[PDB]
Scaffold this motif. Structure first.
Motif, PDB file in Angstrom:
ATOM      1  N   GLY A   1      49.340  47.890  49.758  1.00  0.00           N
ATOM      2  CA  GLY A   1      50.373  46.886  49.457  1.00  0.00           C
ATOM      3  C   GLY A   1      51.542  47.012  50.413  1.00  0.00           C
ATOM      4  N   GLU A   2      52.689  46.532  49.995  1.00  0.00           N
ATOM      5  CA  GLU A   2      53.790  46.160  50.903  1.00  0.00           C
ATOM      6  C   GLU A   2      55.160  46.437  50.264  1.00  0.00           C
ATOM      7  N   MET A   3      55.184  46.705  48.957  1.00  0.00           N
ATOM      8  CA  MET A   3      56.408  46.960  48.168  1.00  0.00           C
ATOM      9  C   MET A   3      56.429  48.445  47.809  1.00  0.00           C
TER      10      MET A   3
HETATM   11 MG   LIG Z   1      52.363  44.651  46.911  1.00  0.00          MG
END
Ligand SMILES: [Mg+2]
Ligand SMILES: [Mg+2]
Length: 94
Positions: free
Chosen positions: A30-32
């Motif tokens: 993911g990215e967060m």
């Molecule tokens: Mg994410």
């Protein structure tokens, strides 16, 4: 020893893409992330790519690794981590 000293470092966010790719390379998904998560995967990246000096495990020789390109550094010390935090302020967005 490297992860011991790495864990002692002082400091929700979306990494910019050059940093995101390094975090994914270290097993992140993911990215967060929390800052705690970002620092954790940076340590994991440094360990799997063996960027640290076996003799001097506070020294990270990151030159001609994409992490050195991102930091704009040949090296940093966990004992003087300002350049890592400079890159993190430029590369984490709220
Ligand atoms: Mg994410
Ligand atoms: Mg850790």
């Amino acid at each position: 020893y490297f992860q011991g000293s790495w864990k002692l470092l002082p400091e929700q966010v979306r990494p910019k893409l050059p940093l995101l790719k390094i975090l994914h390379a270290a097993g992140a998904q993911g990215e967060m992330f929390t800052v705690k998560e970002v620092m954790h995967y940076l340590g994991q990246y440094i360990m799997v790519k063996q960027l640290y000096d076996q003799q001097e495990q506070h020294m990270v020789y990151c030159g001609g690794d994409l992490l050195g390109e991102l930091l704009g550094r040949q090296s940093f010390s966990v004992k003087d981590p300002s350049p890592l935090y400079d890159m993190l302020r430029k590369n984490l967005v709220t």
